[PDB]
Design an enzyme around this catalytic site. Structure first.
Site, PDB file in Angstrom:
ATOM      1  N   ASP A  56      25.218  25.005  51.883  1.00 26.51           N
ATOM      2  CA  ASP A  56      24.484  24.035  52.801  1.00 26.51           C
ATOM      3  C   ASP A  56      23.032  24.401  53.371  1.00 26.51           C
ATOM      4  OD1 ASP A  56      23.281  21.813  53.895  1.00 26.51           O
ATOM      5  OD2 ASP A  56      25.250  21.177  54.553  1.00 26.51           O
ATOM      6  N   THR A  57      22.014  24.390  52.823  1.00 25.38           N
ATOM      7  CA  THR A  57      20.504  24.965  53.485  1.00 25.38           C
ATOM      8  C   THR A  57      20.323  24.143  54.773  1.00 25.38           C
ATOM      9  OG1 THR A  57      19.239  24.054  51.927  1.00 25.38           O
ATOM     10  CG2 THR A  57      19.803  26.018  51.138  1.00 25.38           C
ATOM     11  N   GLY A  58      20.790  23.103  54.820  1.00 23.61           N
ATOM     12  CA  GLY A  58      20.518  22.303  55.691  1.00 23.61           C
ATOM     13  C   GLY A  58      21.353  22.239  56.839  1.00 23.61           C
TER      14      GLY A  58
HETATM   15  O1  LIG Z   1      24.235  17.946  59.267  1.00 22.60           O
HETATM   16  C1  LIG Z   1      23.474  18.671  58.640  1.00 22.60           C
HETATM   17  N1  LIG Z   1      23.311  20.043  59.908  1.00 22.60           N
HETATM   18  C2  LIG Z   1      23.950  20.049  60.950  1.00 22.60           C
HETATM   19  C3  LIG Z   1      24.752  21.050  61.118  1.00 22.60           C
HETATM   20  C4  LIG Z   1      24.640  21.972  62.376  1.00 22.60           C
HETATM   21  C5  LIG Z   1      25.653  22.946  62.651  1.00 22.60           C
HETATM   22  C6  LIG Z   1      26.634  23.232  61.676  1.00 22.60           C
HETATM   23  C7  LIG Z   1      26.728  22.509  60.445  1.00 22.60           C
HETATM   24  C8  LIG Z   1      25.665  21.406  60.260  1.00 22.60           C
HETATM   25  C9  LIG Z   1      22.493  18.735  57.724  1.00 22.60           C
HETATM   26  O2  LIG Z   1      21.909  17.629  57.616  1.00 22.60           O
HETATM   27  C10 LIG Z   1      20.347  17.873  58.100  1.00 22.60           C
HETATM   28  C11 LIG Z   1      20.209  17.981  59.402  1.00 22.60           C
HETATM   29  C12 LIG Z   1      19.407  19.186  60.244  1.00 22.60           C
HETATM   30  C13 LIG Z   1      19.352  19.250  61.682  1.00 22.60           C
HETATM   31  C14 LIG Z   1      19.780  18.315  62.425  1.00 22.60           C
HETATM   32  C15 LIG Z   1      20.604  17.141  61.761  1.00 22.60           C
HETATM   33  C16 LIG Z   1      20.710  16.973  60.518  1.00 22.60           C
HETATM   34  C17 LIG Z   1      23.423  18.650  56.213  1.00 22.60           C
HETATM   35  O3  LIG Z   1      23.011  19.434  55.206  1.00 22.60           O
HETATM   36  C18 LIG Z   1      23.790  17.321  55.952  1.00 22.60           C
HETATM   37  O4  LIG Z   1      22.591  16.912  55.105  1.00 22.60           O
HETATM   38  C19 LIG Z   1      24.982  17.373  55.094  1.00 22.60           C
HETATM   39  O5  LIG Z   1      26.230  17.822  55.551  1.00 22.60           O
HETATM   40  C20 LIG Z   1      27.216  18.251  54.858  1.00 22.60           C
HETATM   41  C21 LIG Z   1      28.046  17.173  54.087  1.00 22.60           C
HETATM   42  C22 LIG Z   1      28.179  17.013  52.603  1.00 22.60           C
HETATM   43  C23 LIG Z   1      28.851  15.990  52.130  1.00 22.60           C
HETATM   44  C24 LIG Z   1      29.727  15.036  52.804  1.00 22.60           C
HETATM   45  C25 LIG Z   1      29.496  15.105  54.405  1.00 22.60           C
HETATM   46  C26 LIG Z   1      28.792  16.466  55.024  1.00 22.60           C
HETATM   47  C27 LIG Z   1      25.166  15.842  54.693  1.00 22.60           C
HETATM   48  O6  LIG Z   1      25.373  15.063  55.684  1.00 22.60           O
HETATM   49  N2  LIG Z   1      25.023  15.395  53.448  1.00 22.60           N
HETATM   50  C28 LIG Z   1      25.091  13.917  53.382  1.00 22.60           C
HETATM   51  C29 LIG Z   1      23.805  13.136  52.955  1.00 22.60           C
HETATM   52  C30 LIG Z   1      22.487  13.406  53.614  1.00 22.60           C
HETATM   53  C31 LIG Z   1      21.705  12.728  53.287  1.00 22.60           C
HETATM   54  C32 LIG Z   1      21.513  11.791  52.415  1.00 22.60           C
HETATM   55  C33 LIG Z   1      22.817  11.529  51.739  1.00 22.60           C
HETATM   56  C34 LIG Z   1      23.904  12.294  52.096  1.00 22.60           C
HETATM   57  C35 LIG Z   1      25.492  12.244  51.428  1.00 22.60           C
HETATM   58  C36 LIG Z   1      25.817  13.518  51.844  1.00 22.60           C
HETATM   59  O7  LIG Z   1      25.585  14.622  50.960  1.00 22.60           O
END
Ligand SMILES: O=C(NCc1ccccc1)[C@H](OCc1ccccc1)[C@H](O)[C@@H](O)[C@@H](OCc1ccccc1)C(=O)N[C@H]1c2ccccc2C[C@H]1O
Lengths: 99, 99
Positions: A25-27
């Protein structure tokens, strides 16, 4: 290897003698794994993403093997829906985004 | 271009004639942008992240330029913490993960 994004980029990781599936996960700034026991002391932390924040346990200097590549870094443990390999460890295996 | 992950993979995107910063996120299935006005009708969608679920508005066939690469696809709009370019558009620009 070169991983396409047609499907979720899931890979096998090895941590604490256990095999698990994780998402590259690059995000994600850090790495967060589902509830599990790890050695050493931990510190509480709150991480926020889509949907809000969750409380996790922070473990430092943890060794993880990603697709055969050894990496060391902080690992967060908490109620995450899926195991996430974040930037803190992706950098260690030399992972980059290309287009 | 090759993007390393020592820092967040933020890029400039152009949508609706405006420049915005967004995160190239391999962990996101879809693309979700902060509140903004987009043309046409929208459909409802619920997306789940690490903190829970949020309701977003789904717009289809939206033109979006990412790092100069033109893409046309589905864009979700909602209370996301940051603009996220997900796999649906990362695949359109030929983005892959390498190590
Ligand atoms: O949650 C994220 N980062 C936070 C983080 C901080 C510390 C450690 C781990 C993660 C990232 O989000 C960007 C972000 C960056 C800064 C602040 C808030 C959000 C994660 O990559 C985020 O985009 C990703 O989290 C992993 C994940 C995958 C599948 C199911 C649950 C969690 C996510 O939430 N993906 C979902 C998503 C996102 C947009 C549209 C549709 C969908 C369906 C799923 O795939």
């Amino acid at each position: 290897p070169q991983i396409t994004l047609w499907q979720r980029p899931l890979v096998t990781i090895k941590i604490g003698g256990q095999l698990k599936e994780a998402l590259l996960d690059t995000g994600a700034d850090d790495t967060v794994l589902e509830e599990m026991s790890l050695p050493g002391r931990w510190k509480p932390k709150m991480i926020g993403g889509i949907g809000g924040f969750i409380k996790v346990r922070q473990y430092d200097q943890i060794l993880i093997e990603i697709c055969g590549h050894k990496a060391i870094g902080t690992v967060l443990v908490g109620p995450t829906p899926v195991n996430i390999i974040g930037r803190n460890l992706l950098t260690q295996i030399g992972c980059t985004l290309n287009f």
